[PDB]
Amino acid sequence: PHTYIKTPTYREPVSDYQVLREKAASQRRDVERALTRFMAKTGETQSLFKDD
Amino acid sequence: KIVAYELKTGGVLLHPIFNPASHLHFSIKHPHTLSWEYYSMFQCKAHLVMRLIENRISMEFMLQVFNKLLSLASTASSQKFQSHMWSQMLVSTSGFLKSISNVSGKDIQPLIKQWVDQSGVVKFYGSFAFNRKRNVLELEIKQDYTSPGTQKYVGPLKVTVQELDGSFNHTLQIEENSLKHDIPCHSKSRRNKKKKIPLMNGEEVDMDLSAMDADSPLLWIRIDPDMSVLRKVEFEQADFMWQYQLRYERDVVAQQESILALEKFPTPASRLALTDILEQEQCFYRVRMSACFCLAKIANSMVSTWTGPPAMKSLFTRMFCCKSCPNIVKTNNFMSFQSYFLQKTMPVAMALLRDVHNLCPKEVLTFILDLIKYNDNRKNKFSDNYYRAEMID
């Protein structure tokens, strides 16, 4: 059934609303955490705890 | 606000006569010696006393009084005579009462003498008993007139009784020596047949009469429903009467006072009443926002009895989350303005839940943190700052 005939295949698509909500949420949380840590490290900083 | 302030410190005296008020640490002869809280409560009491004058003398006559004052002022405002006529633009108390007496023929001098010249609010303590033999309702209304902020009321008093035959108003004459007021009660033939019980408005509803007493027809009682005096009422109903007044009343102040009085009865019927109020659109939204906090207090008081999940969580996932994912919140669409306010007030009350160890449960804290993480506001036409601020709260 493979000697002479060929048909194409595709990659597995993830159309699930749960995992898409999870992916967009975690990527937004991670990029805003990275942005706020970068901006707090390269400027004047405060701290709730002593030398934190 | 005013009964809290007047019972806290002395009282607000509209129209003093020149000290007239010596119970308070400043002089009321000039506006610049008044405390700022006294100035705020002065304006507040002034507009409530004007609502009382509208209650005695109807609203169209009141607007005619105001139009007569404005018309005298605007005929005065065009003259050139240096104040021969420019003082008709200045109102006084005697001129205001005279214009009221001109347009209506009634004078309000007892109402002015009680609520303006006298500086106090009244306190009502009511309790009822139903006489089954003579079919009467014996009310017992006593006043606390020896507190520092209080005064004694001797006028008439409206009371609204909802019985099975409908809603009936009664006027009671509360003289100084009065204590027991016997009002008559109607039939109970709407429990013989299942018929709908007619409400305060023209409509009628189906009520579950299993919680009601078998011998009494009366479903709830409200002392002074229209707020026609400056009063603080402390009525002693039964808990099922407070639940019926929360569910089937067509007055928002009675639903609010039944929410306020259901915190003393933590029975599961009251939890069912507040949960049915919370699920109910076509209830006024500020009643449901109060029922959130009342349900939180009741849930804290009946720990080691609570069966299922924490309070309002399943209701939040039923109202505001996705059907396929219960722990993922729906993307923000704030275009309804009543489920927006309820959505932003429900986790704030849900966070007041406490376990048997007095610590907030990790099921509600995790729920609030998932409400924070899965928040998506790229799709509504409104901002998210108040909802996120309430999430921090």
Side-chain angles (χ1 to χ4, degrees):
Chain A
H2 87 271
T3 38
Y4 53 86
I5 35 172
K6 26 53 179 188
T7 76
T9 178
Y10 282 75
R11 196 50 196 193
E12 189 68 20
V14 281
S15 281
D16 188 20
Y17 186 71
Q18 155 76 37
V19 73
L20 262 291
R21 281 303 297 276
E22 173 65 30
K23 282 312 164 51
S26 67
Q27 286 199 3
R28 180 193 51 84
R29 295 290 304 277
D30 288 330
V31 69
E32 88 185 31
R33 178 202 167 84
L35 176 57
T36 53
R37 295 220 161 217
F38 169 67
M39 206 81 58
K41 269 151 189 163
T42 69
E44 298 316 291
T45 183
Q46 305 201 61
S47 64
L48 300 103
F49 292 82
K50 283 293 190 283
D51 297 334
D52 200 21
Chain B
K1 216 184 287 169
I2 305 163
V3 300
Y5 187 76
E6 290 215 34
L7 297 183
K8 166 198 158 190
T9 166
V12 175
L13 177 51
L14 319 174
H15 193 239
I17 287 303
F18 324 108
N19 49 2
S22 62
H23 44 86
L24 82 184
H25 59 94
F26 46 89
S27 85
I28 58 163
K29 293 167 58 190
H30 208 267
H32 293 318
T33 61
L34 294 190
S35 173
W36 193 254
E37 201 178 2
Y38 187 85
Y39 192 45
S40 303
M41 293 315 147
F42 190 89
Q43 311 170 216
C44 195
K45 198 181 168 171
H47 88 266
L48 291 193
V49 169
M50 282 282 180
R51 193 191 160 261
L52 264 49
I53 303 177
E54 182 258 355
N55 277 15
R56 189 179 267 217
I57 292 183
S58 54
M59 192 204 284
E60 47 96 19
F61 282 164
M62 185 64 106
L63 297 173
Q64 281 170 18
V65 173
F66 299 159
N67 171 63
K68 281 188 160 213
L69 293 186
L70 281 160
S71 180
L72 277 174
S74 74
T75 61
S77 159
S78 50
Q79 313 311 318
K80 137 195 291 176
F81 331 126
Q82 304 78 343
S83 92
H84 289 45
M85 205 160 305
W86 284 350
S87 77
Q88 290 168 22
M89 272 177 304
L90 300 172
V91 77
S92 64
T93 308
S94 70
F96 180 63
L97 302 189
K98 203 193 308 301
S99 170
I100 281 180
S101 177
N102 283 169
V103 83
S104 69
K106 300 178 283 291
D107 72 328
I108 44 167
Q109 197 44 66
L111 194 140
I112 295 294
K113 195 208 167 212
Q114 184 156 25
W115 297 117
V116 179
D117 277 318
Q118 263 198 34
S119 157
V121 298
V122 305
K123 282 181 104 171
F124 283 128
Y125 296 92
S127 83
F128 74 104
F130 177 73
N131 198 299
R132 191 197 171 271
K133 168 184 172 303
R134 323 200 288 116
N135 208 29
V136 308
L137 171 58
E138 326 181 339
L139 281 151
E140 200 261 3
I141 308 172
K142 40 184 188 310
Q143 310 174 53
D144 167 44
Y145 61 96
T146 72
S147 293
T150 42
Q151 78 178 5
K152 153 171 275 37
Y153 188 64
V154 288
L157 184 88
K158 178 154 163 268
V159 58
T160 290
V161 185
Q162 174 87 31
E163 312 172 23
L164 290 159
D165 279 46
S167 187
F168 313 101
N169 318 108
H170 299 85
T171 286
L172 267 43
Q173 206 78 30
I174 56 199
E175 308 193 306
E176 326 83 22
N177 52 52
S178 76
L179 196 75
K180 278 278 178 192
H181 309 280
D182 295 322
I183 73 178
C185 275
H186 290 258
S187 175
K188 45 174 71 63
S189 67
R190 307 228 182 196
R191 201 191 297 126
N192 286 113
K193 286 105 74 175
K194 235 58 184 171
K195 287 205 141 185
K196 339 247 302 170
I197 294 143
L199 289 177
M200 190 181 74
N201 56 338
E203 314 294 296
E204 49 180 358
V205 286
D206 286 23
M207 302 198 191
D208 192 358
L209 307 176
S210 49
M212 203 172 41
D213 274 28
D215 48 297
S216 69
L218 56 97
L219 283 135
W220 66 84
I221 314 161
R222 304 166 60 203
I223 287 184
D224 196 43
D226 293 326
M227 293 169 290
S228 45
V229 286
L230 262 48
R231 87 290 191 278
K232 178 176 187 307
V233 213
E234 286 106 353
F235 201 54
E236 301 269 320
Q237 268 168 52
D239 46 1
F240 71 92
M241 304 190 171
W242 289 118
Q243 290 144 25
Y244 283 137
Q245 191 179 154
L246 185 43
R247 290 192 220 216
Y248 306 104
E249 184 83 75
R250 302 290 92 201
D251 195 4
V252 285
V253 291
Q255 296 189 322
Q256 266 149 35
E257 78 194 10
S258 56
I259 275 168
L260 201 40
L262 271 191
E263 300 169 357
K264 323 172 291 184
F265 314 105
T267 60
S270 58
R271 167 186 173 190
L272 182 59
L274 298 151
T275 315
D276 290 333
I277 284 297
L278 258 179
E279 250 178 331
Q280 198 195 320
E281 296 92 5
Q282 95 193 17
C283 180
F284 180 50
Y285 75 98
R286 299 186 164 278
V287 178
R288 307 158 78 194
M289 297 201 317
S290 299
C292 291
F293 290 85
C294 184
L295 188 49
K297 289 169 193 164
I298 279 179
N300 292 1
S301 73
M302 55 195 266
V303 291
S304 74
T305 302
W306 198 275
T307 54
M312 303 153 277
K313 176 167 149 49
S314 176
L315 183 52
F316 202 99
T317 57
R318 179 187 320 148
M319 267 202 279
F320 306 110
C321 300
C322 302
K323 279 90 167 181
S324 60
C325 301
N327 53 12
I328 315 295
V329 67
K330 281 195 183 298
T331 75
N332 289 349
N333 191 20
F334 294 152
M335 67 179 288
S336 161
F337 295 163
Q338 322 196 19
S339 31
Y340 158 67
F341 276 126
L342 189 54
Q343 182 189 181
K344 93 190 208 195
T345 196
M346 211 180 295
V348 186
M350 217 188 306
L352 292 151
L353 266 297
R354 297 296 186 255
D355 270 338
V356 198
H357 325 290
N358 293 115
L359 289 138
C360 173
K362 178 76 170 218
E363 233 180 313
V364 220
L365 168 65
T366 306
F367 177 73
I368 287 155
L369 292 172
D370 296 349
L371 270 161
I372 289 177
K373 172 151 60 169
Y374 294 107
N375 180 41
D376 209 57
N377 203 81
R378 302 173 302 162
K379 280 131 84 173
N380 47 358
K381 330 170 301 183
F382 302 111
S383 294
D384 211 1
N385 49 302
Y386 290 106
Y387 176 61
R388 290 199 306 251
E390 293 294 336
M391 286 328 285
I392 304 301
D393 293 348

